């Protein structure tokens, strides 16, 4: 669902200004549910905020209060904890780069295993979700601690589940079966380029995001000539 408008008005400005691009004349387009044009599942979800009983805290000026540390792995015995609660990977930002994602996938430490689950379906969404649950529970029984939901290897016969829906279903199933604490759900979905999509994924369960599609788009633009800044810096 990329667009040239989306690229030239949301991706290049981020690099140029070091921040999310601004605007005015707030959205007046019809909701996704009413819009005739096909829309991704993300548009159906609207963010929330605090009005009364609590203030909206600031970030830039109150940076000392923020905390972006993320832990990947499996938690240990909370009531009697010793060193295995902390024998885990810890990140500074939820987002990941290609090199970082490949390092996580290639880590072969026996305690921190990695599994790749193809989040794809053919005709039946219920069948796809149940199959994904089966892979998840089989991997947990084997002893994995990291799950990789990848939309790659997708062709004309296999289509991708909405990543938000897939992540929410996996998280709810894991919570219900009492195994979420033993795993870490990393998500690799192409449809992740807005802070809205990112925040939705983290809020609904995703441990980290690897916008490989956005990185490839930046590679293509740099190869073409636009966005002269280097690939790693970008």
């Amino acid at each position: 669902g990329y667009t040239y408008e989306d690229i030239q008005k949301y991706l290049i400005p981020v690099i140029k200004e070091g921040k999310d691009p601004l605007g005015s004349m707030g959205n007046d387009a019809p909701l996704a549910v009413l819009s005739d044009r096909a829309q991704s599942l993300f548009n159906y979800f609207k963010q929330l905020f605090a009005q009364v009983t609590n203030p909206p805290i600031d970030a830039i000026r109150e940076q000392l209060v923020t905390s972006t540390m993320t832990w990947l792995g499996a938690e240990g015995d909370l009531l009697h904890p010793s060193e295995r609660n902390v024998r885990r990977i810890k990140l500074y930002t939820p987002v990941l780069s290609n090199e970082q994602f490949y390092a996580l996938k290639t880590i072969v430490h026996p305690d921190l295993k990695s599994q790749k689950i193809d989040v794809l379906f053919s005709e039946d969404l219920e069948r796809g979700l149940k199959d994904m649950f089966t892979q998840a529970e089989k991997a947990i029984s084997q002893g994995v601690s990291l799950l990789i939901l990848s939309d790659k290897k997708m062709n004309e016969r296999l289509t991708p589940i909405p990543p938000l829906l897939a992540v929410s279903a996996l998280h709810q199933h894991l919570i219900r079966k009492g195994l979420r604490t033993k795993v870490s759900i990393i998500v690799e979905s192409g449809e992740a380029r807005e802070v809205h999509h990112f925040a939705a994924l983290i809020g609904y369960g995703a441990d980290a995001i690897n916008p490989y599609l956005a990185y490839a788009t930046y590679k293509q633009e740099i190869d073409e000539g636009r966005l002269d800044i280097s690939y790693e810096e970008a």
Partner: protein
């Protein structure tokens, strides 16, 4: 494409400077035993795909051979031979009883799975078990390879030989019989080399300004060692930028906040790109980051008195020439990044002896070896009016050529 030709050309230059005949060049241009094998493997789905293997022993006149193993999907015979020659040069420079070698497999660890990697490694050993043994070959960790793969390889060689051989393969886990300090070997080597270079050039280490771009394990350990020694760090950089403070940066706090990746830059604060970081005032500069950074444009902007190439060929010929003209000491990467090889050798010696040393003993032995090697190469490079890279290549090739001449193959 040009790696093999470049290696041959530098070897020819070193041999010409030594003055040995062309027979040694004829023998050493090409590895003496290259094996190509096909490894059957069973996937999770049940289908069978065949991976192409490789193995090269550049020379074994000195004694048993050694080399790493990379699961890089673009590994080819030319690259394998070039890496074998490069490892032989490393061994010659460090004055080890190794000859040199390298192995590899054409695969993709990314799409490969855990059990599938296990089976792949096991099939690789079953394939090349004939020409590999304690007195013939010694695998070691490398790109896309680590302690688990080392342990699987050790377990299988134990199975095939019917007796325990912990010294068969290096880089094993600590419980399996590994050696302590396996992760800080490169940092310790560069620390010794920077200390000795500062001593020789007269720059006092106390209060010396240091810049460390690239903050992985090597950068973190190097910064910690510099702080412990006394030298102040006035710059750090990582994948997310860098910092700058002429009067220290609280390396203790930086290491305390160090994350898994080593990223240290703040969130809502501007950062300094490596291009401008290189230009910052400092006594010693330590590029341990992406290759091809020091070039003609920044050669005139560099200001450090000592440059240590902890990475693999971060500079170019033009930059090397400009630095030599400016009279800036340039540490070859071959000597800068030999800590891994040295610690692997110590691990092999410990396994062969059956008794395990301690951190202090490993520290002392490693620093002794590094200081002796650096002093020897510095003396030779000052005796002969040449560049330190040429001196390193010449010293490395000297031992191999002379041992071959003794053994009479020529």
């Amino acid at each position: 494409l040009d790696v093999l030709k470049s290696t041959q050309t530098v070897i020819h230059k070193a041999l010409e400077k030594l003055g040995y005949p062309e027979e040694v060049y004829e023998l050493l241009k090409e590895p003496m035993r290259l094996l190509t094998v096909k490894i059957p493997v069973r996937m999770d789905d049940g289908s069978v795909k065949i991976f192409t293997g490789y193995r090269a022993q550049h020379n074994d006149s000195v004694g048993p051979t050694k080399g790493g193993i990379r699961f890089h999907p673009n590994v080819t015979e030319k690259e394998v031979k070039a890496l074998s020659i490069w490892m032989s040069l490393k061994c010659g420079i460090i004055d080890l009883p190794y000859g040199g070698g390298k192995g590899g497999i054409v695969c993709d660890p990314r799409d490969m799975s855990f059990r599938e990697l296990e089976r792949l490694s096991r099939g690789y050993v079953r394939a090349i078990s004939q020409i590999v043994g304690p007195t013939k070959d010694v695998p070691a960790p490398d790109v896309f390879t680590n302690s688990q793969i080392m342990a699987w390889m050790m377990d299988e060689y134990s199975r095939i030989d019917e007796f325990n051989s912990p010294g068969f393969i290096t880089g094993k886990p600590l419980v399996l019989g590994g050696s302590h300090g396996r992760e800080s070997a490169t940092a310790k080597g560069v620390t010794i080399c920077i200390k000795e270079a500062a001593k020789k050039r007269g720059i006092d280490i106390k209060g010396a300004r240091v810049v460390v771009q690239g903050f992985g394990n090597a950068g973190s350990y190097l910064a910690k060692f510099m702080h412990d020694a006394g030298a102040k760090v006035v710059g750090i950089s990582d994948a997310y930028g860098g910092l700058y403070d002429p009067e220290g940066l609280d390396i203790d706090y930086l290491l305390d906040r160090r994350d898994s990746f080593g990223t240290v830059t703040k969130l809502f604060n501007d950062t300094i790109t490596n291009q401008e970081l290189l230009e910052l005032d400092c006594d010693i500069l330590v590029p341990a980051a992406i290759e091809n950074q020091i070039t003609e444009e920044n050669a005139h902007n560099i200001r450090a008195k000592i440059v240590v190439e902890a990475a693999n060929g971060p500079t170019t010929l033009e930059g090397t020439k400009i630095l030599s003209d400016r009279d800036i000491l340039l540490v070859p990467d071959v000597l800068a990044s030999a800590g891994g090889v040295t610690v692997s050798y110590f691990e092999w010696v410990q396994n062969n002896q059956g008794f395990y040393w301690s951190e202090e003993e490993v520290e002392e032995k490693l620093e002794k070896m590094m200081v002796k090697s650096f002093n020897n190469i510095y003396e030779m490079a000052n005796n002969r009016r040449i560049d330190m890279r040429l001196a390193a290549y010449m010293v490395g090739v000297r031992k191999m050529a002379e041992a071959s001449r003794f053994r009479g193959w020529i």
